[PDB]
Design a protein around this ligand. Structure first.
Ligand SMILES: Cc1cn([C@H]2C[C@H](OP(=O)(O)O)[C@@H](COP(=O)(O)O)O2)c(=O)[nH]c1=O
Ligand SMILES: [Ca+2]
Length: 129
């Protein structure tokens, strides 16, 4: 896998955001995670977490996996990095997302995120409290 440039257009919620990629606006959906919706428990905190992480970043990068790059809704499916730090992983590590939607062909960072979830679950953080 490799990292590609992108710029933040706008935070949306825990696991989606509007980025400019190859000069075009797209909604990105984070691979391998599920944040609660804004109206659910920990939803506002997920959105806040993701929003801060991507808004404070100097450099946003996207990393596609080996499989499908866009979902049925036209959302790009990628791993998102903010100053080299994976948003998908940080959400999981803090208990603000669950590992989810693990499809074959698009699961390179699965075990990395599962390790992060275990740690969150041990620490009883947020969703696991
Ligand atoms: C994360 C991800 C979601 N999706 C689709 C499956 C789900 O379909 P349904 O809309 O039919 O439930 C939906 C979940 O996204 P959200 O969690 O953003 O709603 O997005 C994929 O197709 N591939 C993926 O990698
Ligand atoms: Ca969600």
């Amino acid at each position: 896998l490799h990292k590609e440039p992108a710029t933040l257009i706008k935070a949306i919620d825990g696991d989606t955001k509007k980025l400019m990629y190859k000069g075009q606006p797209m909604t990105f959906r984070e691979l391998l995670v599920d944040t609660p919706e804004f109206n659910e428990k920990y939803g506002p905190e997920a959105s806040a977490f993701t929003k801060k992480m991507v808004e404070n970043a100097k450099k946003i990068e996207v990393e596609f996996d080996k499989g499908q790059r866009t979902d049925k809704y036209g959302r790009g499916l990628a791993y998102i990095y903010a100053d080299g730090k994976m948003v998908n992983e940080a959400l999981v590590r803090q208990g603000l997302a669950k590992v989810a939607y693990v499809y074959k062909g698009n699961n390179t960072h699965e075990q990395l995120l599962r390790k992060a979830e275990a740690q969150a679950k041990k620490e009883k953080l947020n969703i696991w409290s």
